């Protein structure tokens, strides 16, 4: 006999964005229509305090400085595909036979497991895109 | 598990891997003997 012992599977460990400690640098907001947003911009209005000057020195003027920071925009996406046989056995039991019930439950677990894997992949895509942007922003230490 | 690619980079597809580890098998033995004279003195007492 050809002994088929126990069948073991993988554990996909799950990731939440806020659980990871990059989210202390992040600050994460649902805005439902950012799809429609072309630009976002913040506008800063600084004024600098002067110091009184002594003898023989021109006192400087009231310096007012206005700047504006734009918003980078960055999409992410995940595809996963289902086969046509999976789509057929997902939606009906043709006859109510035992094999057909087995395949119906396998198609259902295929769809569910792929949905969970894709949601995890969107979380990790948020992780990686945010790390990408911090690395593009960050100048190195000798320059700083 | 995958990760979401950025702007218009083609993501890898859904990777499912199957492995099958096999069994070695290996015998052991021990031989030991009893002599004919010992086997005579084992149970059938000739005299008392």
- Render chain A in DSSP notation, one character per residue: ----------------TTTSTTTTT------TTTTT-S--EEEEEEE-------TT-PPPP--EEEEEEE------B------HHHHHHHH--SS--HHHHHHHHHHHHHHHHHHHHHHHHHHHHHHHHHHHHHHHHPPPTTT-
Residue A67 CB neighbour total at 10 angstroms: 9
| Distance in Å, alpha carbon of A98 to nearest chain B alpha carbon | 26
Give contacts of A80 with chain B, Cβ < 8 Å. Answer: 13-14
CA distances to A45, A84, A110, A123 from A117, in Å = 45, 20, 11, 10
Angle at A120 between CA A86 and CA A114, to 5 degrees: 5
Solving technique = cryo-EM
Q: Nearest residue on chain B to A120, judged by CA atoms?
A: B1
| Distance in Å, alpha carbon of B1 to nearest chain A alpha carbon | 6
| B13 and chain A in contact, CB less than 8 A | yes
Give contacts of A106 with chain B, Cβ < 8 Å. Answer: none
| Distance in Å, alpha carbon of B29 to nearest chain A alpha carbon | 24
Q: Which of A3, A117, A126 sits opposite B1 (nearest CB)?
A: A117
User: Which residues are CB-neighbours of A82 under 8 A, at least 6 positions away?
Assistant: A90, A110, A111, A114
Q: Are B11 and A78 in contact (CB under 8 A)?
A: yes
> What Rg, from alpha-carbon coordinates, does chain B have?
35
Query: What is the resolution of the experimental data for this entry, in Å?
Result: 9.0
Q: Hey, which residues does A64 pair with through a beta bridge?
A: A47
Q: Hey, which residues does A77 pair with through a beta bridge?
A: B5
CB–CB of B14 and A117 under 8 A? Answer: yes
Give contacts of A126 with chain B, Cβ < 8 Å. Answer: 4
The one-character DSSP state at B5 is B
């Amino acid at each position: 006999f050809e002994a088929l012992l126990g069948i073991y599977c993988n554990k996909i460990e799950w990731i939440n964005f806020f659980t990871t400690p990059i989210a202390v640098a992040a600050n994460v907001i649902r805005f439902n229509d950012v799809s429609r947003m072309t630009l976002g911009k913040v506008l800063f209005f600084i004024q600098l305090p002067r110091v009184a000057t002594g003898n023989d020195v021109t006192a400087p003027k009231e310096t007012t400085i206005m700047v504006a920071k734009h918003s980078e925009k960055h999409p992410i996406n995940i595809s996963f595909d289902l086969s046509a046989a999976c789509l057929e056995h997902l939606e009906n039991t043709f006859k109510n036979t035992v094999i057909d019930q087995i395949l119906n439950i396998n198609a259902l677990h295929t769809v569910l497991r792929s949905l969970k894997n894709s949601a995890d992949s969107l979380e990790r895509g948020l992780i990686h895109a945010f790390m990408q942007t911090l690395l593009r922003k960050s100048p190195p230490q000798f320059i700083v």
